[PDB]
Design a protein around this ligand. Sequence first.
Ligand code: CLA
Ligand code: CLA
Ligand code: CLA
Ligand SMILES: CC1=C(/C=C/C(C)=C\C=C/C(C)=C/C=C/C=C(C)/C=C/C=C(C)/C=C/C2=C(C)CCCC2(C)C)C(C)(C)CCC1
Ligand SMILES: CC1=C(C/C=C(\C)CCC[C@H](C)CCC[C@H](C)CCCC(C)C)C(=O)c2ccccc2C1=O
Ligand code: SF4
Lengths: 98, 83, 143, 146, 159, 740
Amino acid sequence: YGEQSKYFDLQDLENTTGAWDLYGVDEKKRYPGLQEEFFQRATDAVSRREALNGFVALTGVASIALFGLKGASTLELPITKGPRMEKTENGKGGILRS
Amino acid sequence: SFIGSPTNLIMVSSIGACLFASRFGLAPSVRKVAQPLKLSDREVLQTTGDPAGFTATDVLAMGAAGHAIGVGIVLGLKGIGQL
Amino acid sequence: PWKQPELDPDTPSPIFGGSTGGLLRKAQVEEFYVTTWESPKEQIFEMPTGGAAIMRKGPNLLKLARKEHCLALTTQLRTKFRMSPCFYRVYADGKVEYLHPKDGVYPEKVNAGRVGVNQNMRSIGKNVDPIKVKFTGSEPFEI
Amino acid sequence: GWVTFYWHWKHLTLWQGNVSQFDESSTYLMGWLRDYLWLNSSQLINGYNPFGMNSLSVWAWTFLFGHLVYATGFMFLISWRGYWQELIETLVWAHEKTPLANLVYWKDKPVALSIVQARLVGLAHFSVGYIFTYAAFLIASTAGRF
Amino acid sequence: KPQQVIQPINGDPFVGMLETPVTSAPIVANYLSNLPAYRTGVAPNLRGVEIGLAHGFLLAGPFIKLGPLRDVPGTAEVVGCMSAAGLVLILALCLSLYGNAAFQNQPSMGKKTLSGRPLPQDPLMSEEGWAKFAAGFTVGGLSGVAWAYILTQILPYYS
Amino acid sequence: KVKIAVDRNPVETNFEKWAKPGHFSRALAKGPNTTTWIWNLHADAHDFDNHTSDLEEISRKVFSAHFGQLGIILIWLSGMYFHGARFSNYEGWLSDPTHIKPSAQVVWPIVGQEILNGDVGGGFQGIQITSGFFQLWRASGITSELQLYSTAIGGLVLAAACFFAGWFHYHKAAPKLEWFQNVESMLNHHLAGLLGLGSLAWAGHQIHVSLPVNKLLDAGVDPKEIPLPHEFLLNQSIIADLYPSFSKGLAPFFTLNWAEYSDFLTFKGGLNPVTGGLWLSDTAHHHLAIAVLFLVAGHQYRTNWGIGHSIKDILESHKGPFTGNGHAGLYEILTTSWHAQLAINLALFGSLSIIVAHHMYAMPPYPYLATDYGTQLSLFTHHMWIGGFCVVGAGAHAAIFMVRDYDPTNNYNNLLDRVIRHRDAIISHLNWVSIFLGFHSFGLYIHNDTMSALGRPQDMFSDTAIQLQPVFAQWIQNTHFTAPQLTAPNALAATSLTWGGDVVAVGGKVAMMPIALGTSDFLVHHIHAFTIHVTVLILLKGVLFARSSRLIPDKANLGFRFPCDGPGRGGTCQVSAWDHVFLGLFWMYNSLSIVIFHFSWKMQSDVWGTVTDSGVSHITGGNFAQSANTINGWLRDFLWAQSSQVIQSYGSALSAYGLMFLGAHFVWAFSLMFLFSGRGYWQELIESIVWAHNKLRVAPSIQPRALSITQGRAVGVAHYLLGGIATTWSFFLARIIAVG
Ligand code: CLA
Ligand code: CLA
Ligand code: CLA
Ligand SMILES: CC1=C(/C=C/C(C)=C\C=C/C(C)=C/C=C/C=C(C)/C=C/C=C(C)/C=C/C2=C(C)CCCC2(C)C)C(C)(C)CCC1
Ligand SMILES: CC1=C(C/C=C(\C)CCC[C@H](C)CCC[C@H](C)CCCC(C)C)C(=O)c2ccccc2C1=O
Ligand code: SF4
């Protein structure tokens, strides 16, 4: 490959099509050794996509149900507070409904 | 431009310096084409009298450049309060 | 042609600069196309996906992501220089296919060596209505 | 739109009691515009004015929403597929050939909307924006006065 | 001596990139190759831990600073953090969906680092590897959100 | 080397080619079999590339085409001068510019048009004009209608001379290709000669003619007893009292004592308080300095006398390593392609027209022009749109050069070839910055609209709420305001009152006042940047992908203006660069419409108004800082708060603006047929109509055909642009006339 002008050889077609990792290294365990098993045990219970999709949905539906029922009115969101006295009548051209 | 004024002296010295600069190499005249360092000594038309290449357009351009440099020097010195 | 030619890995390629228009990840995943020709001298041509490239005296090699690029380059070469090149297809597993004439004397000629395919002996407009071929899976023009 | 413009303006002038205004103003189109699309839209656009905001805020927002969806329909309707395919190809080269995002790759190849699909989505945005902006204007104009 | 800085990659004028000083700079190449997403020998969960930590630490900021309750003192710093945690959970769900979608098949062609020497397979390019990567991403995002929360509680400056 | 190569009598002067309308094209020389022959006739009428492949005949054709356009413009200018001479109130306007509205078009009493002859004052009735010709005729010192008559007759004479010159320089004495290829002589003669000679002549006219007339005009002297400019020209005594430096009599010019000319060649910043325009002495020194700068720049290139610069050497010598071959072949392209030079000249002309509009709205160069709000708004909007059109045409003709005159032989590794090489990177980065600007401008607008609608104005992007203060523009304003203090100590005041601290006013109306920039101006300016980036993306993509693309590799062989390559590859509709320009025209329209809406609203809300003793009151209530942050605020407080005079214009002097408004609505709406629809449905409808005409034997010999797809797109964009332009024109003019 690339001897004087050739860019194709058909036995190293991994080089012919242009598949190149411009930024790729194979250095293993760059972080210190005691640091992995704290996080390796963190992931192993949620490593499966079934365990992770459930956990995201578990924290999803519960916290969404927490909002509004308990999440609102503690932050004083302006949806569960109520009016003082606004907008009983309507109609500037007369009729004055409600 | 009264004879004896500093502006007249500046103008005449600029004109004479420009003719000296164009007489013997040393300026991008009609004889000397200009590279970044102005070489190769070509020849076109004729000098009509004195040697080198002082043609009708050589003294016309150098007089124009010498006059135009003089307005920069005189008005520059006038703006800063000199002569 | 008389014998089906196989492209040579050794053949050179024209000098060219870096062009953004070129081979993509479809070259890696799916198939890609390769064009070959033999040159008499060094001439300047325009690639169908890039700019201008000076080609090599002798054999040459172009890789195009699409067959349309290959035939556009072929038509450009044949029109400009009476060049008559040929292109191929290289699959992901390394399989090589020959699409530019298997008979070798171009689709413009006949050569009395190819069989008529997808040809209807009936006139256009003599085809039956879609109701007559409804719920059958066959189109009126496919009959 | 013509039949509902006629109905809404005639009935609005009947309810307001000035049927002579409709009788002498529906003849010429400038009066049609001035006394229907401009006069009745005064209460519509004052839904969320910076000085004061009232219950017509959803109607002005829906009016502008219908304008925006109408304009997106125009986006699909004027331009056609073939300039969009090249732009999507350039975006494909952008995503496939960049650091920290070439690892994420699509499974369905991004292609431009087909011409029949283009007409369908342009008609869909056109009609959705048309309906929403007219419903917003009609309800706001009729309900602001009565 | 023309100094042709702009040249195609690997001397190949046929593919997409051309080697440019934005790409060919030693500082840029060393910084990108040392980023966690390009550490091929490291496990994808350890990739996701650092990636999620960085992204969950950065994503908390705009939610606290420009949130709807930013003018309320003491409560903006908790609302921004739990909204950032919710955003991290949403991104984790979409990451898991991408891992399901893009790795239902098996890749057959390697990456071919420069001048050869390619490893058998990136564990990130696998199904369970990307699932572990998304797990590391959500754990890192939650820990980064909590860290940005406690950094808004103890502080010598601002928040 | 440079000479005058001219071929004498190449084309006979006869009506032989007038007899047969289709003669320039061999395809149209057969006959009109279909109705598309007529549209191809009027379309390929001036396309000289496919008429012949010889560059010399094309150069002669375009030379006489420019001669004909110059004669047409001179005829138009002579007609305007004649209208100001005969049907105008210029004599009344000279004695009272602040109370008499300008008028130079008089309608006939034929059918109800007498209501259009509005009461403009001065005992005169007519159409209230907006071009600002009266301000120009007050700057260039003009007193009576006799002088305007003389100017009109001279313009007609020069127009006839220009038409005769075109006829001569094509049919009688046509220059050769080497005559047109003398680029150095062209540049020297149109830098020193055209621009420099015109600037020096205008400076001399201002010094000897316009300065005394304008000095006597603003002093309260009636124009009837003002001496004619030939008296000022011949007699030094009359010009000496108005300007004492004329008593020296050209002595300081040659003796280098130019400081003595500080009375009528002044360097003053600001406007004349009596009139509201720039000082004529400042304009005189300006045009004199411009003449100097163009006389010195017009002697740069080398033509015949050895000295000078060779443009090929300058281009080939600037080579830098990230560009490979640096400007290596561009001299060969620009000396052989008319379309490349057309693109460059049209782009620079359009941009310079944009600068012209901005720098007239900034510094009004005419007396009683700032207070005349209609003339200023019309000039800004008109030159705005003309600049946009020239830029779009520059993109179009660049794409045409790309398709036709571009060849890969001369360019291998130059800048043009490398721009072709990395075109995908340019388009992708432009798309990224397009999406980025679009989101954090228009999404900011939508978010402000939502927070207004949700009853939370404190969450908006406004000055009262969290703000995006344009610190860079305000710092530039402060620097320019303090520029005369330190960096330009010889300036009397600031170069414009955009950033000043004082308010000038003529006749009780504000001429020009300081402009404050806030969050809304930030939002609109970044909206403008987004819109211009999109339009330049469309034009640049059309230019770059005109030759080849990943979709259609053989787009070069398909021509420039082709409808499609068929429904293949999912449908390659509008893939040609012509359709890219067709979309860029609409994007231009949106850009310039929003720009002039910003101009009108900002100037009516923060600049224009009537000055009072108790502060300054503007035209509006100063609501730009409160209503320009939201789309609904923009709508209600600009398009609905205004245009109340257009709808009620009926029965008044400006009812024709309402008629023009509704006709523009009609044409804008009529265009969407040619935009949404296609051709096959219309062709089938035409077939049915052809059957109807066949039934009772009125079948035309020419077969009726539907318009072409490119033809239909052209009709749609033309009707759309004409309708939108006339809509904004009618609305702007009616609002600025009934109020300002
Ligand atoms: C006002 C009308 C309108 C609008 C809004 C658009 C919008 C668009 N066109 Mg189009 N265009 C239109 C009419 C319009 N078009 C017409 C009539 C034509 C024919 C001449 C064209 C011709 C044309 C061309 C030739 C090009 C475009 C492009 C674009 C894009 C520009 C995106 C950008 O930078 O802005 C930012 C995005 C927006 C303004 C969209 C609205 C965003 C709002 C604020 C929502 C924000 C996020 C929101 C909360 C998400 C909702 C979530 C929900 C799903 C739950 C965008 C998709 C260009 C393109 O592809 O991009 C480079 C392009 O090249 N258009
Ligand atoms: C100093 C000499 C000079 C001057 C003043 C001009 C002036 C002009 N040229 Mg140019 N030109 C020149 C030398 C000159 N040319 C040379 C040497 C060449 C050969 C290299 C050309 C080749 C050339 C081409 C190929 C074209 C022009 C064109 C134009 C016109 C551009 C229109 C414009 O910008 O609006 C300015 C408009 C006006 C000022 C209107 C007044 C026009 C008056 C009547 C022209 C008078 C100038 C003329 C040189 C006088 C001598 C001519 C004499 C035989 C009567 C402009 C009038 C264009 C054109 O066709 O227009 C004619 C064009 O396409 N020029
Ligand atoms: C410096 C000015 C200039 C010059 C010399 C040219 C010259 C040329 N252009 Mg360019 N062009 C320009 C400006 C210019 N154009 C601008 C500003 C635009 C943007 C709108 C374009 C857009 C453009 C396109 C898109 C195309 C050209 C083409 C052409 C060629 C033939 C044009 C022709 O035959 O028209 C024939 C003349 C007409 C059709 C008459 C114009 C009628 C228009 C459509 C309507 C005008 C209405 C009017 C404004 C108001 C009247 C209202 C009505 C009710 C009466 C020729 C090379 C074409 C070509 O093939 O290039 C080689 C081509 O495809 N140009
Ligand atoms: C040696 C000799 C001689 C002598 C000679 C001489 C001494 C000469 C001189 C000459 C000269 C000495 C010339 C000059 C010229 C100049 C010029 C031509 C310049 C200029 C012009 C003008 C017109 C100007 C302008 C301007 C202005 C107005 C402003 C701005 C600036 C300027 C300055 C540019 C004799 C013959 C006796 C004898 C033999 C030898
Ligand atoms: C309407 C339409 C047509 C049909 C339009 C045609 C055939 C052009 C008709 C031009 C007319 C004949 C010009 C003259 C108009 C009037 C006859 C002028 C009347 C003047 C009075 C004084 C009588 C197309 O061909 C078409 C093609 C492609 C895209 C869109 C469309 C499209 O929308
Ligand atoms: S709809 Fe028209 S423009 Fe589009 S591919 Fe078909 S024929 Fe071409």
